[PDB]
Protein backbone atom coordinates (compact mmCIF):
# COMPACT_ATOMS: atom_id res chain seq x y z
CA UNK A 1 0.00 0.00 0.00
CA UNK A 2 0.79 3.77 -0.14
CA UNK A 3 3.03 5.29 2.59
CA UNK A 4 3.23 9.14 2.53
CA UNK A 5 6.94 10.22 2.75
CA UNK A 6 8.61 13.59 3.09
CA UNK A 7 11.95 14.95 2.01
CA UNK A 8 14.81 13.97 4.30
CA UNK A 9 15.11 17.31 6.21
CA UNK A 10 11.30 17.18 6.95
CA UNK A 11 11.32 13.38 7.58
CA UNK A 12 13.88 14.01 10.40
CA UNK A 13 12.85 17.39 11.81
CA UNK A 14 9.02 16.67 11.90
CA UNK A 15 9.82 14.28 14.83
CA UNK A 16 11.16 17.22 16.92
CA UNK A 17 8.85 19.44 19.03
CA UNK A 18 10.26 22.69 17.48
CA UNK A 19 9.44 21.76 13.84
CA UNK A 20 7.88 24.59 11.75
CA UNK A 21 5.51 23.28 8.98
CA UNK A 22 6.91 25.87 6.50
CA UNK A 23 5.27 28.38 4.13
CA UNK A 24 4.23 25.85 1.44
CA UNK A 25 0.48 25.61 2.14
CA UNK A 26 0.07 22.70 -0.42
CA UNK A 27 2.38 20.48 1.72
CA UNK A 28 0.37 20.86 4.95
CA UNK A 29 -2.23 18.15 4.07
CA UNK A 30 0.56 15.65 3.26
CA UNK A 31 2.38 16.58 6.47
CA UNK A 32 -0.81 15.82 8.45
CA UNK A 33 -1.44 12.45 6.67
CA UNK A 34 2.21 11.59 7.31
CA UNK A 35 1.60 12.23 11.01
CA UNK A 36 -1.68 10.27 11.21
CA UNK A 37 0.06 7.35 9.44
CA UNK A 38 3.10 7.16 11.81
CA UNK A 39 1.32 7.96 15.13
CA UNK A 40 -1.94 5.97 14.47
CA UNK A 41 -1.29 3.64 11.46
CA UNK A 42 -1.96 3.43 7.67
CA UNK A 43 -5.14 1.52 8.81
CA UNK A 44 -6.70 4.15 11.19
CA UNK A 45 -8.52 5.98 8.33
CA UNK A 46 -9.50 5.19 4.73
CA UNK A 47 -7.17 7.51 2.75
CA UNK A 48 -9.94 8.80 0.37
CA UNK A 49 -12.28 9.78 3.30
CA UNK A 50 -9.33 11.27 5.28
CA UNK A 51 -8.15 13.43 2.28
CA UNK A 52 -11.77 14.60 1.73
CA UNK A 53 -12.13 15.40 5.49
CA UNK A 54 -8.76 17.39 5.64
CA UNK A 55 -9.72 19.43 2.55
CA UNK A 56 -13.21 20.29 3.97
CA UNK A 57 -11.53 21.25 7.28
CA UNK A 58 -9.11 23.56 5.41
CA UNK A 59 -12.03 25.19 3.50
CA UNK A 60 -13.78 26.02 6.84
CA UNK A 61 -10.75 27.90 8.31
CA UNK A 62 -10.80 31.62 7.37
CA UNK A 63 -8.00 33.83 6.06
CA UNK A 64 -7.33 35.58 9.42
CA UNK A 65 -3.78 36.45 10.58
CA UNK A 66 -3.37 33.83 13.39
CA UNK A 67 -6.44 31.47 13.87
CA UNK A 68 -5.99 29.94 10.40
CA UNK A 69 -5.32 26.60 8.71
CA UNK A 70 -1.50 26.91 9.38
CA UNK A 71 -2.28 27.21 13.17
CA UNK A 72 -4.43 24.06 13.01
CA UNK A 73 -1.68 21.93 11.41
CA UNK A 74 0.96 23.45 13.74
CA UNK A 75 -1.18 22.49 16.78
CA UNK A 76 -1.65 18.94 15.29
CA UNK A 77 2.16 18.59 14.74
CA UNK A 78 2.85 19.47 18.44
CA UNK A 79 0.24 16.75 19.41
CA UNK A 80 1.95 14.29 17.00
CA UNK A 81 5.30 15.03 18.78
CA UNK A 82 3.74 14.49 22.24
CA UNK A 83 2.04 11.23 21.13
CA UNK A 84 5.25 9.85 19.51
CA UNK A 85 7.41 10.62 22.60
CA UNK A 86 4.79 8.90 24.93
CA UNK A 87 3.93 5.91 22.66
CA UNK A 88 2.55 3.60 25.35
CA UNK A 89 0.36 5.98 27.52
CA UNK A 90 -2.43 6.54 24.95
CA UNK A 91 -5.23 4.33 23.66
CA UNK A 92 -5.97 3.64 19.96
CA UNK A 93 -9.06 5.91 20.11
CA UNK A 94 -7.04 8.70 21.80
CA UNK A 95 -4.35 8.48 19.07
CA UNK A 96 -7.07 8.75 16.29
CA UNK A 97 -9.15 11.43 18.06
CA UNK A 98 -6.51 13.90 19.35
CA UNK A 99 -4.78 14.66 15.96
CA UNK A 100 -8.28 15.18 14.51
CA UNK A 101 -9.27 17.37 17.50
CA UNK A 102 -6.15 19.49 16.99
CA UNK A 103 -6.75 19.94 13.21
CA UNK A 104 -10.37 20.98 14.00
CA UNK A 105 -9.95 22.96 17.28
CA UNK A 106 -10.27 26.48 15.80
CA UNK A 107 -12.67 25.60 12.91
CA UNK A 108 -14.46 28.68 11.43
CA UNK A 109 -12.66 31.13 13.74
CA UNK A 110 -13.29 34.80 12.89
CA UNK A 111 -10.20 36.30 14.70
CA UNK A 112 -12.28 37.51 17.71
CA UNK A 113 -12.37 36.34 21.34
CA UNK A 114 -15.33 34.83 23.24
CA UNK A 115 -15.47 38.19 25.04
CA UNK A 116 -15.84 40.30 21.81
CA UNK A 117 -18.69 38.01 20.59
CA UNK A 118 -20.50 38.48 23.97
CA UNK A 119 -20.15 42.31 23.77
CA UNK A 120 -21.16 42.51 20.06
CA UNK A 121 -24.13 40.16 20.90
CA UNK A 122 -23.20 37.74 18.11
CA UNK A 123 -25.80 35.00 17.59
CA UNK A 124 -23.20 32.30 18.73
CA UNK A 125 -23.08 34.07 22.17
CA UNK A 126 -26.80 33.17 22.67
CA UNK A 127 -26.42 29.57 21.39
CA UNK A 128 -23.28 29.05 23.70
CA UNK A 129 -23.05 31.11 26.96
CA UNK A 130 -19.44 29.99 27.83
CA UNK A 131 -16.56 28.67 25.72
CA UNK A 132 -18.54 30.27 22.85
CA UNK A 133 -16.13 29.72 19.90
CA UNK A 134 -14.98 26.29 21.25
CA UNK A 135 -18.57 24.94 21.24
CA UNK A 136 -18.78 26.34 17.69
CA UNK A 137 -15.47 24.65 16.69
CA UNK A 138 -16.77 21.23 17.96
CA UNK A 139 -20.14 21.88 16.16
CA UNK A 140 -18.26 22.60 12.83
CA UNK A 141 -16.31 19.35 13.40
CA UNK A 142 -19.48 17.16 13.70
CA UNK A 143 -20.95 19.02 10.63
CA UNK A 144 -17.92 18.09 8.46
CA UNK A 145 -17.86 14.47 9.83
CA UNK A 146 -21.49 14.15 8.65
CA UNK A 147 -20.95 15.26 5.02
CA UNK A 148 -21.22 12.45 2.42
CA UNK A 149 -17.90 10.51 2.23
CA UNK A 150 -16.29 12.44 5.18
CA UNK A 151 -16.91 9.95 8.02
CA UNK A 152 -13.32 8.96 8.82
CA UNK A 153 -14.71 7.12 11.91
CA UNK A 154 -17.08 4.82 9.80
CA UNK A 155 -15.00 1.67 10.76
CA UNK A 156 -15.57 2.32 14.57
CA UNK A 157 -18.43 0.64 16.58
CA UNK A 158 -21.36 2.79 17.86
CA UNK A 159 -19.69 3.01 21.34
CA UNK A 160 -16.13 3.54 19.99
CA UNK A 161 -17.62 6.26 17.68
CA UNK A 162 -19.32 7.88 20.71
CA UNK A 163 -16.13 7.70 22.85
CA UNK A 164 -13.92 9.28 20.10
CA UNK A 165 -16.46 12.21 19.52
CA UNK A 166 -16.38 12.65 23.31
CA UNK A 167 -12.51 12.78 23.41
CA UNK A 168 -12.69 15.38 20.54
CA UNK A 169 -15.37 17.46 22.31
CA UNK A 170 -13.47 17.60 25.60
CA UNK A 171 -10.12 18.20 23.77
CA UNK A 172 -11.62 21.19 21.83
CA UNK A 173 -13.45 22.68 24.90
CA UNK A 174 -10.10 22.51 26.83
CA UNK A 175 -8.56 25.00 24.28
CA UNK A 176 -10.65 27.74 25.95
CA UNK A 177 -7.74 29.36 27.82
CA UNK A 178 -10.30 30.63 30.52
CA UNK A 179 -10.56 26.89 31.57
CA UNK A 180 -6.78 26.16 31.50
CA UNK A 181 -5.94 27.95 34.84
CA UNK A 182 -8.20 25.79 37.11
CA UNK A 183 -7.43 22.67 35.04
CA UNK A 184 -3.63 23.09 35.56
CA UNK A 185 -4.17 23.84 39.34
CA UNK A 186 -6.16 20.60 39.79
CA UNK A 187 -3.50 18.63 37.87
CA UNK A 188 -0.64 20.31 39.85
CA UNK A 189 -2.30 19.35 43.22
CA UNK A 190 -3.14 15.79 41.97
CA UNK A 191 0.53 15.24 40.86
CA UNK A 192 1.99 16.67 44.17
CA UNK A 193 -0.29 14.74 46.61
CA UNK A 194 0.31 11.58 44.43
CA UNK A 195 -3.48 11.17 43.74
CA UNK A 196 -2.92 11.54 39.93
CA UNK A 197 -4.15 8.27 38.35
CA UNK A 198 -4.33 7.76 34.54
CA UNK A 199 -6.83 4.83 34.87
CA UNK A 200 -9.21 7.46 36.29
CA UNK A 201 -11.09 8.72 33.13
CA UNK A 202 -11.68 12.21 34.70
CA UNK A 203 -7.85 12.41 35.30
CA UNK A 204 -7.11 11.35 31.67
CA UNK A 205 -9.57 14.12 30.55
CA UNK A 206 -7.56 16.74 32.53
CA UNK A 207 -4.14 15.51 31.22
CA UNK A 208 -5.54 15.62 27.60
CA UNK A 209 -6.88 19.18 28.24
CA UNK A 210 -3.37 20.26 29.37
CA UNK A 211 -1.80 18.57 26.23
CA UNK A 212 -4.35 20.66 24.25
CA UNK A 213 -3.34 24.00 25.86
CA UNK A 214 0.32 22.99 25.33
CA UNK A 215 -0.21 22.23 21.61
CA UNK A 216 -2.33 25.41 21.18
CA UNK A 217 0.41 27.64 22.72
CA UNK A 218 3.32 25.81 20.91
CA UNK A 219 4.49 28.98 18.95
CA UNK A 220 6.34 29.86 22.24
CA UNK A 221 8.33 26.50 21.86
CA UNK A 222 9.73 27.28 18.38
CA UNK A 223 13.02 28.75 17.11
CA UNK A 224 13.03 32.41 18.23
CA UNK A 225 12.44 33.87 14.68
CA UNK A 226 9.27 31.64 14.44
CA UNK A 227 8.10 32.67 17.94
CA UNK A 228 8.70 36.34 17.21
CA UNK A 229 7.01 36.38 13.71
CA UNK A 230 4.05 34.37 15.03
CA UNK A 231 3.67 36.95 17.85
CA UNK A 232 3.08 39.66 15.16
CA UNK A 233 0.18 37.56 13.74
CA UNK A 234 -1.23 37.01 17.25
CA UNK A 235 -1.27 40.78 18.00
CA UNK A 236 -2.57 41.57 14.42
CA UNK A 237 -5.80 39.80 15.53
CA UNK A 238 -5.91 41.27 19.09
CA UNK A 239 -5.46 44.83 17.73
CA UNK A 240 -8.25 44.39 15.09
CA UNK A 241 -10.51 43.16 18.01
CA UNK A 242 -9.40 46.25 20.05
CA UNK A 243 -10.45 48.51 17.10
CA UNK A 244 -13.86 46.71 17.02
CA UNK A 245 -14.18 47.21 20.84
CA UNK A 246 -13.62 50.99 20.32
CA UNK A 247 -16.28 50.89 17.53
CA UNK A 248 -18.72 49.53 20.15
CA UNK A 249 -17.66 52.51 22.38
CA UNK A 250 -15.53 50.33 24.75
CA UNK A 251 -11.85 50.92 25.78
CA UNK A 252 -10.30 47.52 24.98
CA UNK A 253 -8.00 45.72 27.51
CA UNK A 254 -4.35 46.81 26.93
CA UNK A 255 -3.55 43.45 25.13
CA UNK A 256 -5.90 44.54 22.32
CA UNK A 257 -4.98 48.25 22.13
CA UNK A 258 -2.58 48.88 19.15
CA UNK A 259 -1.75 52.22 20.93
CA UNK A 260 0.09 50.13 23.67
CA UNK A 261 2.35 48.40 21.03
CA UNK A 262 5.40 49.39 23.21
CA UNK A 263 4.26 47.15 26.17
CA UNK A 264 4.24 43.92 24.00
CA UNK A 265 7.62 42.66 25.35
CA UNK A 266 6.35 43.02 28.98
CA UNK A 267 2.93 41.48 27.97
CA UNK A 268 4.90 38.49 26.56
CA UNK A 269 6.82 38.10 29.92
CA UNK A 270 3.50 38.14 31.84
CA UNK A 271 2.10 35.50 29.43
CA UNK A 272 5.19 33.21 29.65
CA UNK A 273 5.20 33.46 33.50
CA UNK A 274 1.37 33.28 34.00
CA UNK A 275 0.44 30.77 31.25
CA UNK A 276 3.12 29.17 29.05
CA UNK A 277 5.87 28.24 31.59
CA UNK A 278 3.37 26.82 34.15
CA UNK A 279 1.64 24.86 31.29
CA UNK A 280 4.82 23.10 30.11
CA UNK A 281 6.13 22.69 33.72
CA UNK A 282 3.04 20.64 34.81
CA UNK A 283 3.07 18.87 31.39
CA UNK A 284 6.74 17.88 31.89
CA UNK A 285 6.03 16.63 35.48
CA UNK A 286 3.20 14.45 34.13
CA UNK A 287 4.90 13.29 30.85
CA UNK A 288 8.65 13.60 31.26
CA UNK A 289 9.51 13.15 27.56
CA UNK A 290 7.71 16.55 26.79
CA UNK A 291 10.62 18.42 28.48
CA UNK A 292 11.94 19.96 25.17
CA UNK A 293 8.74 22.12 25.09
CA UNK A 294 9.50 23.52 28.63
CA UNK A 295 13.18 24.01 27.63
CA UNK A 296 12.20 25.88 24.38
CA UNK A 297 9.57 28.09 26.18
CA UNK A 298 12.21 29.09 28.77
CA UNK A 299 14.67 29.98 25.94
CA UNK A 300 12.00 32.22 24.27
CA UNK A 301 11.19 33.88 27.67
CA UNK A 302 14.88 34.87 27.90
CA UNK A 303 14.71 36.16 24.22
CA UNK A 304 11.76 38.44 25.26
CA UNK A 305 13.82 39.52 28.29
CA UNK A 306 16.70 40.42 25.88
CA UNK A 307 14.21 42.47 23.81
CA UNK A 308 13.21 44.50 26.91
CA UNK A 309 16.96 45.08 27.78
CA UNK A 310 17.43 46.45 24.19
CA UNK A 311 19.88 43.57 23.27
CA UNK A 312 17.26 42.16 20.69
Ligand SMILES: Cc1ncc(C)n2nc(CCc3nc(N4CCCCC4)nn3C)nc12
Pocket residue numbers: 177217219220231234254255256260261262263264265266267268270271
Ligand atom coordinates in the same frame (compact mmCIF):
# COMPACT_ATOMS: atom_id res chain seq x y z
C1 LIG B 1 2.32 33.89 22.32
C2 LIG B 1 0.85 33.75 22.66
N1 LIG B 1 0.17 32.61 22.35
C3 LIG B 1 -1.16 32.46 22.62
C4 LIG B 1 -1.99 33.51 23.18
C5 LIG B 1 -3.44 33.27 23.50
N2 LIG B 1 -1.26 34.68 23.55
N3 LIG B 1 -1.69 35.81 24.10
C6 LIG B 1 -0.67 36.71 24.14
C7 LIG B 1 -0.89 38.07 24.71
C8 LIG B 1 0.11 38.20 25.82
C9 LIG B 1 -0.10 39.61 26.36
N4 LIG B 1 0.29 40.83 25.76
C10 LIG B 1 -0.24 41.75 26.63
N5 LIG B 1 -0.13 43.19 26.55
C11 LIG B 1 -0.34 43.95 27.85
C12 LIG B 1 0.19 45.35 27.75
C13 LIG B 1 -0.04 45.92 26.41
C14 LIG B 1 0.63 45.25 25.32
C15 LIG B 1 0.80 43.80 25.60
N6 LIG B 1 -0.88 41.17 27.67
N7 LIG B 1 -0.76 39.81 27.53
C16 LIG B 1 -1.33 38.79 28.36
N8 LIG B 1 0.45 36.14 23.62
C17 LIG B 1 0.06 34.87 23.26
Ligand SMILES: [Mg+2]
Pocket residue numbers: 105106133175176
Ligand atom coordinates in the same frame (compact mmCIF):
# COMPACT_ATOMS: atom_id res chain seq x y z
MG1 LIG C 1 -9.24 28.55 19.96
Ligand SMILES: [Zn+2]
Pocket residue numbers: 071075105106175216
Ligand atom coordinates in the same frame (compact mmCIF):
# COMPACT_ATOMS: atom_id res chain seq x y z
ZN1 LIG D 1 -5.92 27.45 18.61
